[PDB]
Amino acid sequence: GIIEEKALFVTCGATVPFPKLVSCVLSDEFCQELIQYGFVRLIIQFGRNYSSEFEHLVQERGGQRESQKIPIDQFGCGDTARQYVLMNGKLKVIGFDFSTKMQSIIRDYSDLVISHAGTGSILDSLRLNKPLIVCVNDSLMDNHQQQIADKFVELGYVWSCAPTETGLIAGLRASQTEKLKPFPVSHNPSFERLLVETIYS
């Protein structure tokens, strides 16, 4: 069954690098590692202006769209009713939050999150001594989010690993063995990020 225990929240925050790269985080590699991690309830959501693209991963794998509601189809960014299932209730891919509910999802579960470089996302996970895995984007560099990431290492060596089946697993297993010393950068919750998206108050 579902077996409530630990959830896994992942967010790309800024515009994703390439539709194919994301697939790795939502493909066979990620799926296999998920079941091996005791899957529970997967939730994913990001992008806004670019409206993302999603290489039709749901249809590609042959998923089933529950809540009948797909305006612009594609990924339905302007829709909070995105819910897909794999095989048969195996993997649950759902998206219903756009930089305006992230904290809402964590508090509800609060167990484990995979932030590639989300300054806000890591912020909460930090105060909650929650061990997460940071997917660093060596390929890119213009991403300000990563810039803020490289700083975390300077202080120590935050679990950093690029989207690889050999490297990503190292961070996962490591995150379930040791925690990062209480260090909540910026005296403010992920809310501070909200200002970035809002830009003008």
CATH code for position 104 = 3.40.50.2000
* Residue span of the structural domain in which 111 resides: 1-201
Residues 89, 53: Cα–Cα separation, whole Å: 24
Q: In terms of residues, how long is the chain?
A: 201
Query: How many independent structural domains does the chain possess?
Result: 1
β-bridge mates for residue 10, sequence order:
44, 114
**What per-residue string of b and e applies to 28-39 under the rule 16 or more CB within 10 Å gives b?**
ebbbeebeebeb
Output DSSP code: residue 151: H
Please, what sign has the CA dihedral across residues 115, 77, 37, 110?
positive
Answer positive or negative: Cα dihedral of 95, 47, 10, 93. positive
Smallest CA-to-CA distance from 11 within 93, 117, 94 is with 117
DSSP code of residue 50: S
Residue 16 CA to residue 21 CA, distance in Å, equals 8
Tokens 């048969």 belong to which residue?
88
CA distance 121 to 150: 15
